[PDB]
Every structure is written in C-alpha cells, then in structure tokens.
A paper describes a structure:
Interestingly, analysis of the symmetry-related molecules in the mAng-2 crystal structure revealed a two-fold crystallographic dimer that is particularly intimate. The buried surface area at the interface between the two molecules is ∼1100 Å2, consisting of 33 amino acid residues from each molecule with a total of ten ionic interactions across the interface. Interestingly, in the mAng-2 structure, His82, Asp41 and two water molecules from the protomer in the asymmetric unit, along with His113 (an active site residue) from a symmetry-related mate coordinate the Zn2+ ion to complete a penta-coordination. A reciprocal set of interactions makes up the symmetry-related Zn2+ binding site, resulting in a head-to-tail packing. In the mAng-3 structure, the binding site architecture is very similar to that observed for phosphate and sulfate ions in other Ang structures and both anions ligate the same five P1 subsite residues: Gln12, His13, Lys40, His113 and Phe114. However, in the mAng-2 structure, the central sulfate ion interacts with none of the above P1 subsite residues except for the catalytic lysine (Lys40). In mAng-2, the productive conformation is observed for this residue. In mAng-2, Lys40 is expelled and ligates a sulfate ion occupying the active site of a symmetry-related molecule. The mAng-2 structure also reveals Lys40 to be reoriented out of the active site pocket, making it ineffective as a catalytic residue. Although the essential arginine is conserved (as Arg33 in mAng-2 and mAng-3), substitution of Arg31 for Val31 in mAng-2 alters the NLS chemical character. In our structures, however, we observe that mAng-2 has a more open active site than hAng or mAng.
Angiogenin (Ang, a 14-kDa protein), an unusual member of the superfamily, is a potent inducer of blood vessel formation that was first isolated from the conditioned medium of cultured HT-29 human colon adenocarcinoma cells based solely on its angiogenic activity. The murine Ang family, over the course of evolution, has expanded to accommodate six members: mAng (the murine orthologue of hAng), mAng-2 (also known as mAngRP or mAng-related protein), mAng-3, mAng-4, mAng-5 and mAng-6 27–31. Experiments have shown that mAng, mAng-3 and mAng-4 have angiogenic activities comparable to that of hAng, whereas mAng-2 is not angiogenic 33–35. The main-chain of both mAng-2 and mAng-3 adopts the familiar α/β fold that is characteristic of other Angs and members of the RNase A family.
Residue numbers in the entry:
A (entry chain A), B (entry chain A): 3 to 120
Write the structure that this text describes.
Amino acid sequence: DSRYTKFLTQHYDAKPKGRDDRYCESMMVKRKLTSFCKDVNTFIHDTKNNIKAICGKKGSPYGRNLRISKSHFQVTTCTHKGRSPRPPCRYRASKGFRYIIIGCENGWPVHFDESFIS
Amino acid sequence: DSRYTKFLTQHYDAKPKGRDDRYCESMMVKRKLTSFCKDVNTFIHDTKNNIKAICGKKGSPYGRNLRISKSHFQVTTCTHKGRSPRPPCRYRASKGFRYIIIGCENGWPVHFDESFIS
Ligand SMILES: [Zn+2]
Ligand SMILES: [Zn+2]
C-alpha cells in the first residue's frame, strides 16, 4: 500500500531517539520532509497495529475522511522555528500524550491531521 | 523586497472575505499555497505597518530569527482537514486575536511561525 507506506514514513516512529529538538531536526531530514521546511509534522510512538486500528472501531468519525482515536497516543510534534523555508531546517519538539486525528482510506492510515486538539 | 512580498502573499489580508472554512479554501488557492495541501497557514488582518513593526521595537526576541509581537493581532489560521495532500484542498478556519511570532530579516517580516501559542 503506497499511501500507507508514505504515512508510515512521515508519522511512525516506535522507538524514538530522544524526542527533543535535535530528534525533530534529524527525523524531518531522514523521513524526507525538508525539501522545503515543512511547518508541522507529528511522529507517533506506538505500534502500527494500534495506529491502523484508528481507521476501524478504535476510531470515531471526525468529519469527512477523518477519524479521531478512542485511545491516547505518545507523540512528538515537530514545528518549524526558523525564518527561512529552505533547508537546513530548524525545529522545536513538543511531546504529547493525546487523542490523534488521522485520514483513512479503505481501513488504512494515509494522513495525519496536524490541527490543535485540547 | 522579494522575501517580504512573499510573506505578504502568504500571510497578509487586511479585509478578509468572511474568515470561515470557505475563506480558507479560497485564499489558500488564491495565494498559491496548494501545490500540495499545506497543512497550516495563518492570515493576518491588520496593516502592513503594524505587522512590520514586530521586526522592530514592537516585537520581542523569541529565539534565533524570531520575534513575538507586543500587541495582539486578528488572525485566521487555516488548517488542512483532508486525507489527501493533492489539491483540491479542504480547510478549517480558526479565528484568533493573539500575539504572533514572525521571522524577521533586516527589519522585514519574511516568515510566520505556525506553532501553538496559549
Ligand atoms: Zn516555516
Ligand atoms: Zn494535510
């Protein structure tokens, strides 16, 4: 599954190396998100099985093509902190344990909604 | 100023047409931010003079190359709400009146920091 694999590349990191700003700066490069300095990207620290389950009965519909998780997930959200959109890109990390919203297609996670949840 | 003009294209809208989801969807296209569905982008509803002043004495240093405004600004933050990164792109709007963080170069606004402020 192409879109599922792309989602994993962008958002899945089961054993994160530190969850700090350096982690974000390294991972944004390693996962190919710095062609321009992408402003927001969240890495999820949990199993692929648990993330995928959000697209089934362990998620709730959250408007068209979105599902919100019924369970909290450990996450690290990387946000751009520089003045230039050209790499190298500087990031701040924000750790969280919260419900997450994902875009689903035919039972598979294909996107991560990066908007604010409170 | 090329980078200043780019900033204005991306972030300046003095008389916004409605500040709702449709506003976001229209403006993200009009301001050329939907080649892929950019996940977050804020439009500022104030004068160019007031925004620029953030890069001077009406801002405070907020870490390298960033300044936080001393005054609140009316803003509409557009966030992607779809499962696909390919246009057409669907958005939600979030209106705010808050301090804003911008990236400055030689006294000119050149970037908008899209991270969470509380
Ligand atoms: Zn940026
Ligand atoms: Zn998106």
